Curated annotation (Swiss-Prot), chain A:
Belongs to the actin family. ARP6 subfamily. Present with 238 molecules/cell in log phase SD medium. Component of the SWR1 complex which mediates the ATP-dependent exchange of histone H2A for the H2A variant HZT1 leading to transcriptional regulation of selected genes by chromatin remodeling. Involved in chromosome stability. This is Actin-like protein ARP6. The gene is ARP6.
From Swiss-Prot, chain B:
Belongs to the RuvB family. It is found in: Nucleus. Its main location: nucleus. Probably forms a homohexamer. Interacts with RVB2 and may form heterododecamers with RVB2. Component of the SWR1 chromatin remodeling complex composed of at least ACT1, ARP4, RVB1, RVB2, ARP6, YAF9, VPS71, VPS72, SWC3, SWC4, SWC5, SWC7 and SWR1, and perhaps BDF1. Component of the chromatin-remodeling INO80 complex, at least composed of ARP4, ARP5, ARP8, RVB1, RVB2, TAF14, NHP10, IES1, IES3, IES4, IES6, ACT1, IES2, IES5 and INO80. Component of the R2TP complex composed of at least RVB1, RVB2, TAH1 and PIH1. Interacts with SPT15/TBP and HSP90. The lineage of its organism: Eukaryota, Fungi, Dikarya, Ascomycota, Saccharomycotina. GO terms for biological process: box C/D snoRNP assembly; chromatin remodeling; DNA repair; protein stabilization; regulation of DNA-templated transcription; regulation of transcription by RNA polymerase II. Present with 11600 molecules/cell in log phase SD medium. The keyword Cell wall biogenesis/degradation does not apply. It comes from the Eukaryota. One of its GO terms (cellular component) is Ino80 complex. One of its GO terms (molecular function) is 5'-3' DNA helicase activity. This is RuvB-like protein 1. The gene is RVB1. The chain holds residues 134 to 265 of 463 of the full protein. Keywords: Acetylation, Activator, ATP-binding, Chromatin regulator, DNA damage, DNA repair, Helicase, Hydrolase, Nucleotide-binding, Nucleus, Transcription, Transcription regulation.
Curated annotation (Swiss-Prot), chain E:
DNA helicase which participates in several chromatin remodeling complexes, including the SWR1 and the INO80 complexes. The SWR1 complex mediates the ATP-dependent exchange of histone H2A for the H2A variant HZT1 leading to transcriptional regulation of selected genes by chromatin remodeling. The INO80 complex remodels chromatin by shifting nucleosomes. Its ability to induce transcription of some phosphate-responsive genes is modulated by inositol polyphosphates. The INO80 complex is involved in DNA repair by associating to 'Ser-129' phosphorylated H2A histones as a response to DNA damage. Present with 3030 molecules/cell in log phase SD medium. The gene is RVB2. The chain holds residues 136 to 202 of 471 of the full protein. The lineage of its organism: Eukaryota, Fungi, Dikarya, Ascomycota, Saccharomycotina. Belongs to the RuvB family. This is RuvB-like protein 2.
From Swiss-Prot, chain F:
Zn(2+) 1 binds at C172, C175, C192, C196. PROSITE patterns: ZF_HIT. It comes from the Eukaryota. The lineage of its organism: Eukaryota, Fungi, Dikarya, Ascomycota, Saccharomycotina. It is found in: Nucleus. Keywords: Chromatin regulator, Metal-binding, Nucleus, Zinc, Zinc-finger. This is Vacuolar protein sorting-associated protein 71. Zn(2+) 2 binds at C184, C187, H200, C205. The keyword Protein biosynthesis does not apply.
Amino acid sequence: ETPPIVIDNGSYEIKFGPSTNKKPFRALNALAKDKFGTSYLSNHIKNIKDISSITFRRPHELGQLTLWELESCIWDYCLFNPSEFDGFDLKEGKGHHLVASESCMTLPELSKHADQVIFEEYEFDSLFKSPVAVFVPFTKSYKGEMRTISGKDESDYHDFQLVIDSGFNCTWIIPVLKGIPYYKAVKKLDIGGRFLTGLLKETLSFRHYNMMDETILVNNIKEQCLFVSPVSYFDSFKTKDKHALEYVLPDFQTSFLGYVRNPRKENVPLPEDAQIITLTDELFTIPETFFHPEISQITKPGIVEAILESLSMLPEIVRPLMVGNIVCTGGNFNLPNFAQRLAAELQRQLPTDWTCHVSVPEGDCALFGWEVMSQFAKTDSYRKARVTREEYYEHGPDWCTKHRFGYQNWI
Amino acid sequence: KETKEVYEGEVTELTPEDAENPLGGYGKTISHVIVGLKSAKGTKTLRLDPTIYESIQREKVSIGDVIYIEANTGAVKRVGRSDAYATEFDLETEEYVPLPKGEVHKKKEIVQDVTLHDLDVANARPQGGQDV
Amino acid sequence: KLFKKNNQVNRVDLDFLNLVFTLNDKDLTSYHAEEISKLTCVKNFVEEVNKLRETNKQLQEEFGEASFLNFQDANQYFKYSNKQKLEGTVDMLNFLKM
Amino acid sequence: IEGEVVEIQIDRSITGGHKQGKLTIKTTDMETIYELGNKMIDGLTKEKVLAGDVISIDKASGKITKLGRSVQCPEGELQKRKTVVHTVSLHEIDVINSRTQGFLALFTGDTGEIRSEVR
Amino acid sequence: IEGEVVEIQIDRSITGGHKQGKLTIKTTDMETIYELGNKMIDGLTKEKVLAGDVISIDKASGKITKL
Amino acid sequence: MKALVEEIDKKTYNPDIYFTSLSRPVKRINYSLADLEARLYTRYTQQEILQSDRRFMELNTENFSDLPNVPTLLSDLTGVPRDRIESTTKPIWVLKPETLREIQLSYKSTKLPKPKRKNTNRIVALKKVLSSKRNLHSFLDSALLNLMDKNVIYHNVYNKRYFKVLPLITTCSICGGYDSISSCVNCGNKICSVSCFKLHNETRCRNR
Ligand SMILES: Nc1ncnc2c1ncn2[C@@H]1O[C@H](COP(=O)(O)OP(=O)(O)O)[C@@H](O)[C@H]1O
Ligand code: BEF
Ligand SMILES: [Mg+2]
Ligand SMILES: [Zn+2]
Ligand SMILES: [Zn+2]
């Protein structure tokens, strides 16, 4: 089996797909149960009628995924169903190869559990697991469309790369030199999709009836209607009266998901008996917690502080090189104007002699990371990088995870 | 027409540098004064002589205030406090201005035309001197 | 304050070009002005410029093609330091003339 | 920002901060407390202020205007945005620029043949 | 007397009271050392000189001028 | 106008300090025992950092049922005892075999497994890994991870030197209005307008 399987394990969603296909198959990672007791599969959560009361229980914790039984069952569902995903199927997988993505700071023991489950249970001939930041230097192997932004202006892989990956679990700033991450300068940002969703549920709980019971509705609103302040919180606050969005609640008897309505857009003349929620301050207030934590009352340092500290732990020679090449991945970067705002706020704190450049790919950044992660398989270096099954049977289970796939060896 | 070069921006950190050598000329002085300047496009640190720093001390400049320093005449002018610091206090006397655009250093020339009689009147009445 | 709107944009200092010269007799003498004007340090800055122009042109004529280019200056170990050196000595080239 | 001052506290310089003070501006509709800005404290200590009088403090101008004692009653919200129209003749504009202080030359009649270039 | 200054030494707390410091004036074709008197010690303090400098001293009135 | 003459007492007046001040009203007095004993026995303060971590984790949690269990995990991440910091700070299962059978009925529609098994030590470890039912706190309590490993994974990742770079922004607690910054009397909280003040006096003022 020449083409391998590319599986990206996230906390919110796990993207799995073959190396031949251009786009990954999106499958949520979670187990949801209704108040009545009915439990539905992760991909079937979108099909249910009533989103009012839902309890989310997922195998992935904040740090890592502790339970491999539910995650293994999700793997059996995604990989073992030919009819659920068009054209995809696997009879066994003894000859197929797997490329996985795990957290950089993941515990070694849970990594042993992962290697034992994937190697022994799934009978994969060869598997190579690396964090998403390591596949970023391989973006230059193939030609693709990626948007470049200059903060100062008004083999195939590359050595110097700075990977800022925002995620549903948390945001990680990982410097990469010579295709290897530098783990002393890696910084962790506790801000993530969970803090934005919960924060929006608290703000909406003070402004209106408490929505904390419904996570999915607040998540959909946060995805659809949220935007980042292009200039500053003050300029966006003086314009909060001009820029406003009205969201109508989906009625369980009629519409499952609500629709965003702009007062400037007359395209929706249809009247309804439902009541509309006004959104003004929460639009630019929620995303601003990254740069300024003081709006959310949290004491966190902020993103740019972690960037400057990450550059502080690096050698003086590699600092101006890594600020010239920056790739942004994850779902939190899909918000509009966030890239240019981050490039400007970072440019203001950098010296005049140094020029900062940020390259954000067009479209969804997660799908981009999966695409480049699939292009890593086509690289001739993957043939030397992959580990054979017999070598894993010879060495102990702790050696494969501790040496080649572990962060402790690169420290 | 004459060309002038100006450094402008918000003051980040300014520190005096005193020489341990007495030199016999003075009892106490400073060798140089380093004042950092912040602007939207970039930041730069400058090395200044004690006189132009004494002018800054006359302007009563503090960390976080935008200043205007011209190289030709060596005059220092304080425009005002930076806009981001305005939220610090509820009531404030000082005006607030945004941070200046431009990297730090700027090169510009002034083509202003002036009649000869205006040179004569400006020549008759001096504007200079602090004398009572 | 309305008449204090931006001036030095289009304003000339007019005291830097010595058209105010009627104030020069108070603290300044004749022979000190003649000797002070005869002793000027000009032609030394031209030498300090010409000696650096060699180190500038040896980098420009050889590595100057890919040096200041942002493409080769994106990721390079050796070239980027040369770019910062050239852009460093250009500032010292114009500064001595100012 | 205008209103009655019930309580104003001002503290001497300490190592912790240059000066710490809190003034209480009470109005009929809203009553809030502001923490002074240093030189604001120099304006309150500059002219003696007694608690219980109605004053109007100018943020942009930086000076205090006392409208009476509590003679008047608080109208409403503390901070309000107002526009101030000033009617000034061409002569009054012309005299100020020709002199160091020209407004005195308006009243004193010493103006003495302003240059035509200024006009 | 016009010339560039090399080094200026003035003793203060070693003994005291105008200890007769000596300064070295340099010209391109000539260099000499001059003894400094008490009143010249008091006069050199005004218009302070760090040396590394070109100054001119009047012979008749002892006036110090910094070029 | 300004009085050029000012009467002053030698003992009472000081140039240092300037002070001016003016059914049944009663000064608010807290009847709490732990508040009075706490008062008599005593850049951000450490306790406020604890409140920021507790509130950050309560806002981080997805479900209500998981809210009470989080402060134990956060207390394990901080290192301070759980009961003490949980009692001092006021904030603001997953797996079942039958449910697993229900999921087996969910994916039972289409599957292509081939069962093969042979008894081996690696298969015993396989059955031990597949069935875990262990919380992350249980893994943190295990000795399998090194102490330096835990320090590097948790304590060493956060930024030590830089607490703040960008300037601070203070906004109202209701609508976040920065135009009028006005602190409340009782709680010292900043309120922009009279409407936000009247809305603040009811729900959001605890110390009143
Ligand atoms: N178009 C969008 N607008 C706003 N947020 C989005 C958008 N798309 C995805 N997200 C956010 O990104 C998150 C998904 O991140 P993901 O790529 O799954 O990271 P992980 O690797 O942690 O699973 C979701 O929680 C969602 O809130
Ligand atoms: F695990 Be995800 F990338 F936050
Ligand atoms: Mg991810
Ligand atoms: Zn408000
Ligand atoms: Zn209150």
